[PDB]
Amino acid sequence: TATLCLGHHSVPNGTIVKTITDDQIEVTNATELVQNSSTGKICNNPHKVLDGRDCTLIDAMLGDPHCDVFQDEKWDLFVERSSAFSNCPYDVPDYASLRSLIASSGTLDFITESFTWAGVSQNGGSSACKRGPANGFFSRLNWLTKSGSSYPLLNVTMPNNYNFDKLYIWGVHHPSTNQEQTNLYVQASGRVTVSTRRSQQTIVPNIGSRPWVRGQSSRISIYWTIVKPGDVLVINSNGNLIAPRGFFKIRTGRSSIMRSDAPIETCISECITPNGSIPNDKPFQNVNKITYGACPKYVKQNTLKLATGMRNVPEIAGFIENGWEGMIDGWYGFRHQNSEGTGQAADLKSTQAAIDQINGKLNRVIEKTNEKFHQIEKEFSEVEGRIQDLEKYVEDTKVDLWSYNAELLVALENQHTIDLTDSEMNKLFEKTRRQLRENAEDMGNGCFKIYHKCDNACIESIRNGTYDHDIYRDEALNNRF
Amino acid sequence: TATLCLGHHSVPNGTIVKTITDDQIEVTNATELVQNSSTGKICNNPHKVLDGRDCTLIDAMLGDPHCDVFQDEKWDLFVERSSAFSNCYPYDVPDYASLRSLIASSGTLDFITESFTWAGVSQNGGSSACKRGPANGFFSRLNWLTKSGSSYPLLNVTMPNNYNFDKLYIWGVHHPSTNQEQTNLYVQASGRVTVSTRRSQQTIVPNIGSRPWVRGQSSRISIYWTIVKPGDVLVINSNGNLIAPRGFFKIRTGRSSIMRSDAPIETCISECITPNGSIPNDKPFQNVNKITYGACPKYVKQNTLKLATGMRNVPEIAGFIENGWEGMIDGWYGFRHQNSEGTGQAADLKSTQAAIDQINGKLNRVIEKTNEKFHQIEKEFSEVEGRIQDLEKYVEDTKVDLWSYNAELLVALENQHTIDLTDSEMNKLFEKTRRQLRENAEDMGNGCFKIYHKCDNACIESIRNGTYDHDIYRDEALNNRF
Amino acid sequence: TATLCLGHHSVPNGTIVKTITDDQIEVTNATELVQNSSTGKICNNPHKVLDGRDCTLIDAMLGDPHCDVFQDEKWDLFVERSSAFSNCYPYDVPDYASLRSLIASSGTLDFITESFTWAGVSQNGGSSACKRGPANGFFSRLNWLTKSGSSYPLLNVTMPNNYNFDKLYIWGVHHPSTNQEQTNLYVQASGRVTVSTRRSQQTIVPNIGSRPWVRGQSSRISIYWTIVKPGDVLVINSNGNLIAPRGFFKIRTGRSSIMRSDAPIETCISECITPNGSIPNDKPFQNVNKITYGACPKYVKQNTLKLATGMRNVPEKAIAGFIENGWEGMIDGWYGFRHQNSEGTGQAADLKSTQAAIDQINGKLNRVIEKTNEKFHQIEKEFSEVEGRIQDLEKYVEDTKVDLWSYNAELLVALENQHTIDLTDSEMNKLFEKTRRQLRENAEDMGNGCFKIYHKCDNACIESIRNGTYDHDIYRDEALNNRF
Ligand SMILES: *[C@@H]1O[C@H](CO)[C@@H](O[C@@H]2O[C@H](CO)[C@@H](O[C@@H]3O[C@H](CO[C@H]4O[C@H](CO)[C@@H](O)[C@H](O)[C@@H]4O)[C@@H](O)[C@H](O[C@H]4O[C@H](CO)[C@@H](O)[C@H](O)[C@@H]4O)[C@@H]3O)[C@H](O)[C@H]2NC(C)=O)[C@H](O)[C@H]1NC(C)=O
Ligand SMILES: *[C@@H]1O[C@H](CO)[C@@H](O[C@@H]2O[C@H](CO)[C@@H](O[C@@H]3O[C@H](CO[C@H]4O[C@H](CO)[C@@H](O)[C@H](O)[C@@H]4O)[C@@H](O)[C@H](O[C@H]4O[C@H](CO)[C@@H](O)[C@H](O)[C@@H]4O)[C@@H]3O)[C@H](O)[C@H]2NC(C)=O)[C@H](O)[C@H]1NC(C)=O
Ligand SMILES: *[C@@H]1O[C@H](CO)[C@@H](O[C@@H]2O[C@H](CO)[C@@H](O[C@@H]3O[C@H](CO[C@H]4O[C@H](CO)[C@@H](O)[C@H](O)[C@@H]4O)[C@@H](O)[C@H](O[C@H]4O[C@H](CO)[C@@H](O)[C@H](O)[C@@H]4O)[C@@H]3O)[C@H](O)[C@H]2NC(C)=O)[C@H](O)[C@H]1NC(C)=O
Ligand SMILES: CC(=O)N[C@H]1[C@H]([C@H](O)[C@H](O)CO)O[C@@](O[C@@H]2[C@@H](O)[C@H](O)O[C@H](CO)[C@@H]2O)(C(=O)O)C[C@@H]1O
Ligand SMILES: CC(=O)N[C@H]1[C@H]([C@H](O)[C@H](O)CO)O[C@@](O[C@@H]2[C@@H](O)[C@H](O)O[C@H](CO)[C@@H]2O)(C(=O)O)C[C@@H]1O
Ligand SMILES: CC(=O)N[C@H]1[C@H]([C@H](O)[C@H](O)CO)O[C@@](O[C@@H]2[C@@H](O)[C@H](O)O[C@H](CO)[C@@H]2O)(C(=O)O)C[C@@H]1O
Ligand SMILES: *[C@@H]1O[C@H](CO)[C@@H](O[C@@H]2O[C@H](CO)[C@@H](O)[C@H](O)[C@H]2NC(C)=O)[C@H](O)[C@H]1NC(C)=O
Ligand SMILES: *[C@@H]1O[C@H](CO)[C@@H](O[C@@H]2O[C@H](CO)[C@@H](O)[C@H](O)[C@H]2NC(C)=O)[C@H](O)[C@H]1NC(C)=O
Ligand SMILES: *[C@@H]1O[C@H](CO)[C@@H](O[C@@H]2O[C@H](CO)[C@@H](O)[C@H](O)[C@H]2NC(C)=O)[C@H](O)[C@H]1NC(C)=O
Ligand SMILES: *[C@@H]1O[C@H](CO)[C@@H](O)[C@H](O)[C@H]1NC(C)=O
Ligand SMILES: *[C@@H]1O[C@H](CO)[C@@H](O)[C@H](O)[C@H]1NC(C)=O
Ligand SMILES: *[C@@H]1O[C@H](CO)[C@@H](O)[C@H](O)[C@H]1NC(C)=O
């Protein structure tokens, strides 16, 4: 007689995963699906990262004297440090919109235009904004005051004869007293009107004392205007006008701005976070919900294990609640007890089928990467109300939905992996049973008892699939009965 | 002796779908789940579609002379063309999008005239920039009041809401270009308009200054609106620069909206409208446009998604073990028998019907029929604004990504389950057939049986029907086997 | 000879569930996953609920005379009733919703009085529209400054922030109805109010004009607010039309919110609060309201979702097995054996298969979906007036969220039902296959889920088969002789 047993491998150390029907199940192999660490540095490749050391984007746009190294710059990502400061006092109504559009433009290209201001004096300065040892001002703005003892009505025009949009930055000066207002501007109540063929803005200055900032009790408000090709710009002013010196060329692209204190190093990475660059070889990440580039999706979980092997079962006997830790050639194989001696082999068909069905399984459902460049703000330092609440709500909803998606996907994939491995083992056992028609009996433990003399060539023929039952039919029948 | 095999059908040409464990598997039949084309026309049934032609909704509401055919109009969807223009006095609307959305969602342009009394001022002002034929004109729903004689008295009027519906009032403020013009039109050197109710107020101070010429005018007019709830009162107080209203608009709650499109409108029936045109809604997903009106499929980024309908296509007596039957056209599963009389073939109705019933209506168990949406947010912009536009784009992008993921995962899961159920059906039929033949037959290794007793056509039909009796032939089969 | 059968239990009354491959399938047990009812009452534990009664949050903050009981109050949820009204000077708040949300999220009404000096003006002005008992009054947290004698000097005051917490200041501007009233109350013919810090500024010019009478007044007051960070300074500059502040509000960070409801408040314990009332959170989904506070189930559009708990239900039709036949007489377990012998029929139960099925079924839904989500302050979801862009965006966001979560719930229920049915069927088949494996050549299956054994198999034999210590070599010769 002879014995033939079928089984599967085992490893000394398994990994616990979670499926649809099991809280904890041990498998031979698993992989991590969530990235939860960073090196703390920002790669300067392949994206173009511009470090604004002590300057904000608005300050560099306006022309702060200590921000003059940023003139005519361009970037893919602008990094704003927490140690930035202003050294020139002003306020911007709707600051966030201007900051966002300047960041999304991706450039600081400024073209000077020849404005004519007749009857007034130009190039005013203050001691609060020093350009060297002398008084200065913003380099992209012009402070106009009275000439002699008169301040006439200003009325200038400039058409857009190009084929791209223009961006104009202008301002209004708010004095602190009526005496100062009349001293700088002869009229007791100024007025600034800037309009195009389709839009208009009129600002009336406000007079009143304010806290001293670098020695000044007055302020300046900043406004902007966009002129389409074929349109025209008209500026009408009675006083308190901070005239523009030109226009900014505005483009459309994939630029943005980020707040971070991580240093920038010479390295390559496609994903940038405020914590630093992270690899994008995993479908999910847990570092930061603020990202730039090709980045994994953000989830609330810190670990998600995906099974890449069959069950780990501790240990002649077959595969019925028994693993073979002595198998290193393949996933499934045969063991036989013969007159010549015991032997072991491996089956390549089932092993390769399982490997093919396992490899690349996650790519069939979830896409590889998503490239997002400019998005909404997700951290705030001041309380505002309605819009901030809406933004926070949207971000929270997105995060919760994606976390649920990740959890369900991982559970389903683990369940299907376990099912396919079990099906492969059972199919191999059933094929082996079907090949031996009447010459063998099932021993009850995944093994077969062959009732005729089956030598090594016989076992090899059984394993190959070229076994003939008619050769040993009568001998097996005589032995069985 | 005899032979009884089991098998399944196959087709000369199959389709490749994707499952959970397979990236490409061939099946006998599949259907497309994504709609990706349109005819370029807009159906005027069953929704009421109003063509704006050369007019916008705001211009038609104000009373533009070339938009006078749109007075007292009704619509379910308003279509705005890119060739629309303005031909009246230049104006601007602060928060234009909010008023446009309000008027579009109201769904009607019904106007009721009221008896306003303006004592001491001139009425019915006009300009050469807004012509009613050969003579000067103005917006038909607004009244331009200027000085009478040499005085402009203080205007203070009231109007109560004694109905049971909301009232919408449209008024304006005139911004002159020079101080001399301001003094000439209105005696006072600084005008002021105050419009208020018992719960809200608005005060506007005009701005004097030159502006680019538009149809010969360097002055502008700003447009404002006020809503008066039932039982409330409206008070208008002014001393210059008032563009008075002539009445109120009825404002309703409904399912109306507005769209920007250039597709023509033709006689046809469709429940879904896109800027590209009308599309059928028989499929659960679409790829034409993310701007939709009516009962429409969900927008996904995928161009195609195939759902499996049949079984695995296996190319071609032998059984079902890696062998499909090309010559079978009468069913999905059946029998082939080899006998002394000759060969034959049949089909199994029960297993085929079970598989068909399981397959039929498979996708309706999860996805709702249709999502009918009428008024939504704007999804395309022609000018950069900032915060709110970014928020809207972010919301739309998140929605699109989530629904694309849902569609992909669902299609993969359904294909996997269809393949599994069909394989289980075939294996169950074979197992039952083996179960009937207790000891008179044994499996030959290729999904087919070898019978050791003389089993004729009546015998084969008895086996197929499920009424086979092994006791009659047991002794002969046992003698043949041993 | 002896007969051995395998089968499963069934119940007289079943319940219908929905799976991936079946529209309507009957099982032995199921549970409801959607909470669609409420008691109509709000529990005051464990959250601190503050009833607004006839006052709103803004009215309580300003100092309305009939809202004077809400001074220095704290809350976790503020409940605003539909019967609230105002009984003081008419006013309007530009961007009212932002201030309401700010005060609701702050969670307290703590007020600290500060010593402002207003030189050359008369303080503590009142009106007949706001009565403190028999006499004329005003808001308790605001100061109405008017001319003293025949002059109104320019006011310029400062107040530094020397603490380590943010300050909130509430002030206002008065809008007269006539120029004569403007001149009588304030000497200057045009007022101006400037309030600023080192990083912000606000200037308001009053409006003049008649308005509808509210409690005898055709004038209004506009409300503005300012926040001062630690180390900053506040400056107020004005020459008329100023409603001065009396101090600052302590502003905090926390998990407080506000809700509009008309449900009464009783003594009970509940972790979730809805405008309909409190609901239990023992289910993953609910259908009551999309406005919630606390640990609440997710909101879905469906009103019922049944999760299968048992196996398929098959009516019971010489003993028979599990092939299209249930056992209504089995109450000892899920799977078992039935044997007919010469001594008589017998029945038993199998514990391992039943225990495995129960352990797989138990706790199945906790593996994918989280228990509860704690949300405290969110966006508004109901509006009493039409506004335009922002309201449309909020409605769109809420509708998208609801649709996505409803789809998730439906798909999850269907998948779980399918897997439960599959696991029960697999367990029964595995038990039958093991029973076949034990009897190698001594019996053959009859096809109805039963084995009939050729040798003599008594109670010891049947018990050995059930346990698993059955030996086939003992009866092999007798079985072979009987079969052939
Ligand atoms: C309306 O009300 C506001 C606020 O109440 C007033 O604003 C104040 O204006 C005064 C000037 O009139 C400001 O005083 C100035 O402060 C400067 C900064 O002081 C800070 O820094 C120094 C050094 O670091 C510290 O010692 C000090 O404590 C502060 O922390 C000083 O540098 C100025 O000095 C100048 O004047 C002195 C006078 O002796 C000279 O000796 C000096 O050489 C120098 O010339 C000056 O003292 C004050 O800071 C303002 N306060 C605020 C909050 O802004 C308005 O003046 C008031 N308007 C009217 C019309 O009344
Ligand atoms: C403040 O600054 C602004 C802009 O700098 C000034 O606005 C300009 O005002 C002048 C008039 O004062 C405008 O000139 C007018 O332009 C009309 C349109 O011009 C277009 O069309 C004509 C004909 O097709 C073309 O030839 C031309 O190139 C343009 O393409 C003309 O139709 C007007 O014609 C009138 O004047 C002529 C003079 O010869 C007469 O013969 C005509 O019959 C007719 O009466 C006129 O020329 C100019 O367009 C305005 N510019 C802008 C940008 O709007 C303000 O006037 C100024 N304010 C002060 C107080 O100085
Ligand atoms: C600009 O235009 C507006 C609106 O047209 C005017 O506002 C009106 O001003 C008048 C003048 O005061 C107001 O009249 C007063 O109304 C009070 C309330 O009346 C309501 O309530 C009573 C009782 O509940 C009802 O019977 C009545 O129908 C109203 O529903 C009255 O109580 C006042 O009575 C006083 O005067 C009478 C005079 O005989 C005395 O007998 C009384 O004892 C008492 O002293 C008074 O009649 C009117 O309410 C205002 N309407 C609105 C809508 O605001 C502005 O006045 C106007 N401005 C200018 C400069 O012209
Ligand atoms: C363009 C201009 O007028 N520049 C002035 C500037 C302004 O007058 C002021 O900042 C606007 O509010 O002020 C400068 O400072 C002045 C002192 O030099 C002078 O002694 O006193 C003035 C006040 O009475 C004023 O502070 C400055 O800021 O440097 C002078 C500069 O030319
Ligand atoms: C209601 C009214 O006053 N209408 C005027 C109109 C206005 O005066 C003006 O548009 C407001 O800015 O202007 C009209 O045009 C005028 C010419 O006819 C006149 O020769 O010159 C005027 C300038 O000095 C003015 O342009 C118009 O727009 O048709 C006349 C109309 O009655
Ligand atoms: C702080 C103050 O001035 N308070 C006045 C108040 C105001 O004058 C008014 O409400 C602001 O618009 O008005 C009071 O009412 C007055 C009557 O008592 C008086 O007979 O007539 C006045 C009109 O000419 C005015 O209505 C009030 O509202 O009680 C008096 C209060 O001291
Ligand atoms: C990445 O940086 C963020 C900073 O935004 C870290 O999140 C903060 O972590 C600290 C310390 O636990 C908390 O006190 C803050 O509340 C967190 N902020 C937010 C917005 O969550 C985060 O821990 C960092 N992650 C890694 C891996 O370095
Ligand atoms: C329906 O119309 C839209 C117009 O928005 C088409 O989308 C544009 O397609 C062109 C050509 O590929 C692109 O260059 C644009 O970028 C697309 N615009 C947007 C906003 O996506 C769309 O292709 C049309 N679809 C059909 C089926 O005609
Ligand atoms: C909980 O209260 C809400 C209040 O909005 C109820 O929803 C309204 O129910 C009425 C009556 O059927 C409808 O006419 C409204 O259209 C509903 N409003 C909304 C926004 O859906 C809700 O039915 C209540 N729930 C329970 C269980 O009583
Ligand atoms: C486990 O799987 C990973 C990839 O999924 C593979 O690289 C690794 O070799 C596997 N483990 C073993 C022991 O082969
Ligand atoms: C393929 O399936 C569709 C159902 O989507 C059916 O209408 C069609 O008849 C099927 N094809 C064949 C050849 O049966
Ligand atoms: C059905 O299941 C519930 C819990 O899921 C349990 O409380 C109940 O007893 C079960 N019903 C029966 C008849 O076992």
Numbering used by the authors:
A (entry chain A): 12 to 99, 101 to 327, 337 to 502
B (entry chain C): 12 to 327, 337 to 502
C (entry chain B): 12 to 328, 336 to 502
Paper text:
One of the key factors for host jump is the switch in sialic acid receptor-binding specificity of the virus, mostly determined by amino acid residue substitutions that occurred in the receptor-binding site (RBS) of glycoprotein HA. The discovery of a degenerative codon at position 228 in the human H3N8 A/Henan/4-10/2022 HA protein sequence, which may encode an amino acid residue G or S, suggests dynamic viral adaptation for human infection. We find that the human-infecting H3N8 HA has a dual receptor-binding property with a preference for binding to avian receptor, and the G228S substitution slightly increased binding to human receptor. We then solve the structures of the H3N8 HA protein in complex with the human receptor or the avian receptor, and identified the structural basis of H3N8 infection in humans.
Next, we solved the apo structure of the HN/4-10 H3N8 HA by X-ray, and the complex structures with avian or human receptor analogs [LS-tetrasaccharide a (LSTa) and LS-tetrasaccharide c (LSTc)] by cryo-electron microscopy (cryo-EM). Comparative analysis of the overall structures between the G228 and S228 variants of HN/4-10 H3N8 HA revealed a remarkable similarity. In the structures of H3N8 G228 and S228 HAs complexed with the avian receptor analog, the receptor adopted a trans conformation and established robust and extensive interactions with RBS residues. These interactions included several conserved binding sites in H3N8 HA, such as E190 and G135. Importantly, the presence of the “avian signature” Q226 also played a vital role in binding to the sialic acid (SIA-1) and galactose (GAL-2) moieties within LSTa. In our study, we found that the naturally occurring G228S mutation plays a crucial role in altering the receptor-binding properties of H3N8 HA for both human and avian receptors. Nevertheless, the HN/4-10 H3N8 strain studied here remains predominantly an avian influenza virus and has not yet fully adapted to humans, as it retains Q at position 226 in its HA.
